[PDB]
Design a protein around this motif. Structure first.
Motif, PDB file in Angstrom:
ATOM      1  N   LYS A  10     -14.502   9.043   1.424  1.00 14.59           N
ATOM      2  CA  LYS A  10     -15.657   8.165   1.244  1.00 14.59           C
ATOM      3  C   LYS A  10     -15.392   6.664   1.367  1.00 14.59           C
ATOM      4  O   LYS A  10     -14.217   6.287   1.305  1.00 14.59           O
ATOM      5  N   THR A  11     -16.442   5.803   1.556  1.00 14.66           N
ATOM      6  CA  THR A  11     -16.136   4.378   1.675  1.00 14.66           C
ATOM      7  C   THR A  11     -15.171   3.862   0.672  1.00 14.66           C
ATOM      8  O   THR A  11     -15.165   4.287  -0.468  1.00 14.66           O
ATOM      9  N   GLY A  12     -14.334   2.935   1.114  1.00 15.83           N
ATOM     10  CA  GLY A  12     -13.324   2.329   0.271  1.00 15.83           C
ATOM     11  C   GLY A  12     -12.161   3.253   0.000  1.00 15.83           C
ATOM     12  O   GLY A  12     -11.242   2.848  -0.706  1.00 15.83           O
ATOM     13  N   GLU A  13     -12.166   4.495   0.555  1.00 13.65           N
ATOM     14  CA  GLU A  13     -11.022   5.358   0.269  1.00 13.65           C
ATOM     15  C   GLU A  13      -9.718   4.982   0.974  1.00 13.65           C
ATOM     16  O   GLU A  13      -8.701   5.659   0.753  1.00 13.65           O
ATOM     17  N   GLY A  14      -9.737   3.924   1.835  1.00 14.02           N
ATOM     18  CA  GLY A  14      -8.514   3.532   2.520  1.00 14.02           C
ATOM     19  C   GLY A  14      -8.205   4.157   3.869  1.00 14.02           C
ATOM     20  O   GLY A  14      -7.040   4.309   4.247  1.00 14.02           O
ATOM     21  N   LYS A  15      -9.254   4.517   4.600  1.00 16.36           N
ATOM     22  CA  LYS A  15      -9.097   5.120   5.907  1.00 16.36           C
ATOM     23  C   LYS A  15      -8.179   4.299   6.862  1.00 16.36           C
ATOM     24  O   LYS A  15      -7.316   4.907   7.514  1.00 16.36           O
ATOM     25  N   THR A  16      -8.355   2.956   6.938  1.00 16.98           N
ATOM     26  CA  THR A  16      -7.521   2.149   7.809  1.00 16.98           C
ATOM     27  C   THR A  16      -6.111   2.576   7.575  1.00 16.98           C
ATOM     28  O   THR A  16      -5.392   2.801   8.529  1.00 16.98           O
ATOM     29  N   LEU A  17      -5.689   2.705   6.344  1.00 26.13           N
ATOM     30  CA  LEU A  17      -4.306   3.129   6.190  1.00 26.13           C
ATOM     31  C   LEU A  17      -4.132   4.646   6.369  1.00 26.13           C
ATOM     32  O   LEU A  17      -3.019   5.071   6.661  1.00 26.13           O
ATOM     33  N   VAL A  18      -5.170   5.458   6.198  1.00 25.88           N
ATOM     34  CA  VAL A  18      -4.909   6.883   6.387  1.00 25.88           C
ATOM     35  C   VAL A  18      -4.350   7.135   7.807  1.00 25.88           C
ATOM     36  O   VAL A  18      -3.653   8.147   8.018  1.00 25.88           O
TER      37      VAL A  18
ATOM     38  N   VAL B 183     -10.563   8.577  15.942  1.00 24.26           N
ATOM     39  CA  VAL B 183     -11.818   7.840  15.908  1.00 24.26           C
ATOM     40  C   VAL B 183     -12.238   7.387  14.503  1.00 24.26           C
ATOM     41  O   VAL B 183     -12.560   8.218  13.652  1.00 24.26           O
ATOM     42  N   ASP B 184     -12.218   6.072  14.263  1.00 23.82           N
ATOM     43  CA  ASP B 184     -12.605   5.547  12.958  1.00 23.82           C
ATOM     44  C   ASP B 184     -14.126   5.592  12.857  1.00 23.82           C
ATOM     45  O   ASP B 184     -14.803   5.125  13.775  1.00 23.82           O
ATOM     46  N   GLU B 185     -14.664   6.174  11.765  1.00 23.58           N
ATOM     47  CA  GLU B 185     -16.110   6.256  11.592  1.00 23.58           C
ATOM     48  C   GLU B 185     -16.649   7.117  12.701  1.00 23.58           C
ATOM     49  O   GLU B 185     -17.620   6.780  13.377  1.00 23.58           O
ATOM     50  N   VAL B 186     -15.993   8.251  12.867  1.00 26.62           N
ATOM     51  CA  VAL B 186     -16.322   9.243  13.872  1.00 26.62           C
ATOM     52  C   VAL B 186     -17.810   9.595  13.954  1.00 26.62           C
ATOM     53  O   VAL B 186     -18.315   9.782  15.064  1.00 26.62           O
TER      54      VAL B 186
ATOM     55  N   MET C 258       0.773  -1.209   0.000  1.00 29.98           N
ATOM     56  CA  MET C 258       0.000   0.000   0.000  1.00 29.98           C
ATOM     57  C   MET C 258       0.806   1.259   0.000  1.00 29.98           C
ATOM     58  O   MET C 258       0.983   1.882   1.049  1.00 29.98           O
ATOM     59  N   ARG C 259       1.320   1.650  -1.141  1.00 31.07           N
ATOM     60  CA  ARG C 259       2.080   2.866  -1.161  1.00 31.07           C
ATOM     61  C   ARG C 259       0.977   3.933  -0.829  1.00 31.07           C
ATOM     62  O   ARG C 259      -0.216   3.613  -0.901  1.00 31.07           O
ATOM     63  N   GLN C 260       1.323   5.163  -0.492  1.00 34.01           N
ATOM     64  CA  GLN C 260       0.228   6.070  -0.183  1.00 34.01           C
ATOM     65  C   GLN C 260      -0.084   7.102  -1.185  1.00 34.01           C
ATOM     66  O   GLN C 260       0.842   7.675  -1.756  1.00 34.01           O
TER      67      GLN C 260
END
Ligand code: AGS
Length: 771
Positions: free
Chosen positions: A91-99, A196-199, A69-71
């Motif tokens: 938005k969904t699928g934008e890669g938040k876990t890695l953000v 907070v994920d999904e704040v 996962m390069r950024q």
């Protein structure tokens, strides 16, 4: 739309990019080594912010190697944004876990400890397991707080540099962490920084209900029983009393009878406060009070009486264990259930962090709340590739059968065309209802009913591929991705040309936010997709929140079976219904956050004045302060109050904490209130010198803490449960213009003074009265 906020942010990423190539040449260790280089630089000068470009750049290549996962810039912009302490709307699928990786690392360099909160256990354990190779590779450690986790392990997790977990456990742990006796059991650490994920989900949405720890009354159950049996056997000589000043005590005859009755042979000591407190209200209830005078016995229960009317003050229960005692006394089933001890809204629990932050897909619209509560600033970010999709309209209907067949039939139709669909529901039963028609007819699919988020998590990924029909509730398979192909480039283009993934929502949700989340699962980055909402007139959101329109339309008659509905005015009504439950909910949090502020100011001091004892802070000037307080009070009561009732004043102090024969002072008539109190107090300073000299200043202080802290707990938990009963009691009121909150504050202010007093007069009693 936040153009320059993103534009200036872009300058930060611009730099990160230039750096990239230099780090490319570096080995794996030349990179780990950098964590130290960083740390040492922080001490020599530079801010966490001054490091930002290199710091994130290092996460870029390490990420770009251990997970691939390069950024991408957008994932960088968002990273900077979390560190800036705001919301990162992607938005969904934008890669938040890695953000999150880049920002944790940066802040974790302080050794303080970063916090990554998720919606559930699975989401947190999975999130940590995925990015740990990045953290570990860089000389940091990660831990996750899961449910039913033993203290030993639990401690180690907050100890680690990075920590992940369910919002429920972080705020939960905390409670126990502040509710606990000694430190051998405190589990938390300093609440420094949180992501907070999904704040919108935890903060805005959950907010509605507070966290509440309660306790199973096994102990209390037979305790009032024993105490009541003993108080029952007791004789007139075993105790002394005074219905004049409503006091009572257990004489020397009783101390021994208790020691002989029970297996406890010491009594009076802080160790036993329990049996002592219980036998106490057991005794008081047996003689100080009486049937048909104080309290009354109606049917299978015992109600309290008001002295200002003679009426039954229903709803209100007796304080600190008293009712439970009277109940034991008469012979009626005791109310020993649900003991509210700890309590807290996320509105405040989260306020308790030095630096707050989070990410989500829908928040800029609720900004006013996010800011005027958590002072969270929503900053929107562009999507990587352009977002091309088909957020289709709301197929409006009447009659759930009409809506349901429309949904079943449109699915057989999309299915043959070969494309996957995602049938979003909002009930385990509705998902089963919609399921029955598909099965009745003969079309395959799976039911994701939010229970085993992991087993179901696998299912939803596959769902995104070829000929698959997946009916999930609004909480099934959340953080999972809908990869067209399920891992194959073949099915990828096949399903990519076929027109992405299709999304159909059974009913319009409780908010635009939740709905766009069904809509969001499709068309990520650069993927085609469609989403439509099959609404109906009987759906509750419209049924109750629609207005006069839906009513007459629903009432009319019946005609075009299976024929959908429309009209400008019809839509104008459908939207008010949702913004109506939007406002309804907006205010339910308002009238939950404020009711918590009142208990939050209280819980705030009861807690600091609880932590003093634990981290060996000096309590001598404070105990002595409250000791003086008890006397300054005796002053206004009998001294000044009645007029100069020396017999009473003295009875009060002998009653309260002074020994048996001590306060003998000449002057009295010649002397004034203050002087008399200065004297009573010097007499007391001496009493303590007798104690220190005969016990040792060290045990005197060591003991000071043992009993201050112990009584706070006993009287605090009871004040909390009772403060809750107070809220329930306001419900049966309204009056002319008497705000239900206003009353609760006053009756909660003096209630706090009563609680604190029950502490003042209690620490001291144990500290002086007997030794
Ligand atoms: N830069 C990237 N390069 C390659 N894959 C990526 C990248 N960023 C994210 N992904 C993938 O995108 C998927 C994860 O997307 P998510 O992180 O779930 O996005 P999201 O839905 O915004 O996150 P949640 O649900 O709030 S964690 C995984 O399959 C990752 O492998």
């Amino acid at each position: 739309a936040d153009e320059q906020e993103i534009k200036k942010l872009n300058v930060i990423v611009d730099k990160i990019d230039a750096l990239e190539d230099s780090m490319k040449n570096l080995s794996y260790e030349e990179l780990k080594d950098m964590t130290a280089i960083f740390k040492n630089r922080l001490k020599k000068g530079e801010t966490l912010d001054d490091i930002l470009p290199e710091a994130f750049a290092v996460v870029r290549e390490v990420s770009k190697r251990k997970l691939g996962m390069r950024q991408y810039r957008v994932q960088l912009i968002g990273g900077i944004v979390i560190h800036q302490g705001k919301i990162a709307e992607m938005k969904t699928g934008e890669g938040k876990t890695l953000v999150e990786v880049a920002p944790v690392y940066l802040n974790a360099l302080t050794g303080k400890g970063v916090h990554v909160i998720t919606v559930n256990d699975y989401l947190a354990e999975r999130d940590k397991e995925l990015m740990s190779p990045v953290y570990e590779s860089l000389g940091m450690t990660v831990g996750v707080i899961i449910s039913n986790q033993d203290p030993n392990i639990r401690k180690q997790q907050y100890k680690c540099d990075i920590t992940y977990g369910t919002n429920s456990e972080f705020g939960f742990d905390y409670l126990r962490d502040n509710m606990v006796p000694d430190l051998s059991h405190k589990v938390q650490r300093e609440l420094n920084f949180a992501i907070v994920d999904e704040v919108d989900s935890i903060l805005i949405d959950e907010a509605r209900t507070p966290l509440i720890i309660a306790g199973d009354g096994d102990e209390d159950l037979k305790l009032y029983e024993l105490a009541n049996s003993f108080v029952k056997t007791v004789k007139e000589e075993d105790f002394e009393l005074d219905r004049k000043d409503k006091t009572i005590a257990l004489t020397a005859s009783g101390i021994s009878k208790a020691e002989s009755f029970f297996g406890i042979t010491n009594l009076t000591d802080i160790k036993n406060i329990e049996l002592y407190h219980h036998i106490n209200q057991a005794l008081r209830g047996h003689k100080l009070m009486e049937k048909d005078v104080d309290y009354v016995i109606s049917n299978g229960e015992v109600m309290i009486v008001d002295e200002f009317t003679g009426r039954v003050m229903d709803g209100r229960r007796y304080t600190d264990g008293l009712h439970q005692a009277i109940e034991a006394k008469e012979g009626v089933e005791i109310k020993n259930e649900s003991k509210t001890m700890a309590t807290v809204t996320y509105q405040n629990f989260f306020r308790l962090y030095e630096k707050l932050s989070g990410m989500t897909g829908t928040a800029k619209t609720e900004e006013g709340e996010f800011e005027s509560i958590y002072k969270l600033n929503v900053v929107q970010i562009p999507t990587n590739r352009p977002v091309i999709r088909a957020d289709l309209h709301d197929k409006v209907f009447k009659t759930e059968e009409e809506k349901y067949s429309a949904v079943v039939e449109e699915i057989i139709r999309i299915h043959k065309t070969r494309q996957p669909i995602l049938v979003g529901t909002v009930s385990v039963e509705k998902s089963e209802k919609l399921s029955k028609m598909l099965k009745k007819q003969g079309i395959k699919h799976q039911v994701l009913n939010a229970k085993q988020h992991d087993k179901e998590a696998e299912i939803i990924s596959k769902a995104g591929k070829l000929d698959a029909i997946t009916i999930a509730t609004n909480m099934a398979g959340r953080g999972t991705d809908i990869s067209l192909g399920a891992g194959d480039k073949e099915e990828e283009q096949e399903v990519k040309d076929l027109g992405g993934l299709y999304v159909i929502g059974t009913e319009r949700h409780e908010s635009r936010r939740i709905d766009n989340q069904l809509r969001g699962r499709s068309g990520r980055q650069g993927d085609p997709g469609t989403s439509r909402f099959f609404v109906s007139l009987e759906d509750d959101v419209i049924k109750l929140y629609g207005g006069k329109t839906i009513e007459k339309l629903m009432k009319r008659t019946s005609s075009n079976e299976n024929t959908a509905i429309e009209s400008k005015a019809l839509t104008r009504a459908i939207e008010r219904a949702q913004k109506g439950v939007e406002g309804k909910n907006f205010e339910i949090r308002k009238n939950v956050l404020k009711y918590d502020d009142t208990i939050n100011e209280q819980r705030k001091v009861i807690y600091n004045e609880r932590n003093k004892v634990l981290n060996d802070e000096d309590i001598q000037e404070d105990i002595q302060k409250m000791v003086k307080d008890i006397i300054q009070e005796a002053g206004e009561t009998y001294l000044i109050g009645r007029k100069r009732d020396y017999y009473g004043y003295f009875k009060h102090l002998y009653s309260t904490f002074m020994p048996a024969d001590t306060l003998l002072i000449p002057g009295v008539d010649k002397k004034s209130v203050q002087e008399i109190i200065d004297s009573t107090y010097e007499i007391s300073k001496r009493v303590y010198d007798l104690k220190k000299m005969m016990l040792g200043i060290d045990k005197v202080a060591e003991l000071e803490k043992t009993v201050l802290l112990k009584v706070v707990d006993q009287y605090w938990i009871d004040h909390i449960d009772a403060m809750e009963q107070l809220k329930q009691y306001i419900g049966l009121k309204s009056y002319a213009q008497k705000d239900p909150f206003k009353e609760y504050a006053l009756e909660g202010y003096d209630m706090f003074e009563a609680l604190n007093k029950n502490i003042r007069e209690a620490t001291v009693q144990y500290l002086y009265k007997f030794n």
